[PDB]
Amino acid sequence: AGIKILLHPSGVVERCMVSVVYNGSALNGIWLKNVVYCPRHVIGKFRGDQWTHMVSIADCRDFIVKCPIQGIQLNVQSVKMVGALLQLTVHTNNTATPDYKFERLQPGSSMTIACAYDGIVRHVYHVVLQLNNLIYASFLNGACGSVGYTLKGKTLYLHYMHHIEFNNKTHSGTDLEGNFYGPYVDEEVIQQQTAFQYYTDNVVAQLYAHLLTVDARPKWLAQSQISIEDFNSWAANNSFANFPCEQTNMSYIMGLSQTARVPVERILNTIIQLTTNRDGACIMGSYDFECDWTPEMVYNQAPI
Amino acid sequence: XAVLX
């Protein structure tokens, strides 16, 4: 009946979160099995290819690692740099380690962010990896090491770890394998970002979500339709990704079109019209086009 | 133009 932004429970992540303090810097890390993962820039703000030598001479005793939930202080026996992350081997194996997987996220997919400070998850919110490989999140200093995750039956799927904030208040990081999303690095210098592009699949889901919870026949809904092929020709010149961005999203979108009794061609023409006729209309509780509603999460909460 | 968290 009601379609909301669903988040995954953060208890599993909370039990694995730890604080990492190397001399001056203090950030967060995740502790899985006998390994603690955390951003590498905790040992200094370096650049390019000096990380190998800087990490290789980093003292294990300078790493103060504490698990606040379990009240356990950890001791680092080895240090390994995997990508832009540090893999700190510890003596104690985390008994709270769940069945986990390191899954890289494709753009347009959602994930829950466990924003943590001093090893304690303070806030939890929902983001979607945008087509520029950035997330639009909310972080302060000391929040690096916070993880983005999803769940699938007691199995924790870690997708992200926070590293850097850009001046436009966009955020970037790595997967849990150490590789950044996009062409961004953990350096405090000007880095060019590709122009913004709307994940059309998600924008379609947001409009469908409004039709199923707020107004089935709103005044901004197009009385006209446009083919997918004609929409994609318009989308190339209006910062909208080619539809569909994921072929698997078509089954969810077709299901939404049958439930709302509005074909996707009407939604796509509404998107085009809203580019010039929106005039501040609130759509699914937002004043602009959002990529935060995925077709799967909207279809999973819909009738029939 | 960018800052480490």
Residue numbers in the entry:
A (entry chain A): 1 to 304
B (entry chain J): 1 to 5
Task: Reproduce the article's own wording on this structure.
The crystal structure contained six Mpro molecules per asymmetric unit. In the crystals, two neighboring molecules, protomer A and protomer B, formed a typical homodimer. Each protomer contains three domains: domain I (residues 1–97), domain II (residues 98–186) and domain III (residues 200–304). Domain I and II each have a chymotrypsin-like fold, and domain III is composed of five α-helixes and contributes to the formation of a homodimer. The substrate-binding pocket, which contains a catalytic dyad (His-41 and Cys-144), is located in the cleft between domains I and II. As an irreversible inhibitor, the Cβ atom of the vinyl group on N3 is bound to the Sγ atom of Cys-144 through a 1.8 Å covalent bond. Surprisingly, the loop from residues 41–51 of PDCoV Mpro adopts a conformation similar to that of IBV Mpro, which supports that the Deltacoronavirus may be closely related to Gammacoronavirus.
CoV main proteases (Mpros), also called 3C-like proteases, which play a vital role in the proteolytic pathway in viral replication, are known to be among the most attractive and ideal targets for antiviral drug design. Mpros are responsible for cleavage at no fewer than 11 sites, indicating their main role in virus replication and pathogenesis. Mpros always function as dimers and employ conserved cysteine and histidine residues at their catalytic site as charge-relay systems. Porcine deltacoronavirus (PDCoV) is a novel CoV that belongs to the genus Deltacoronavirus and causes atrophic enteritis, severe diarrhea, vomiting and dehydration in pigs.
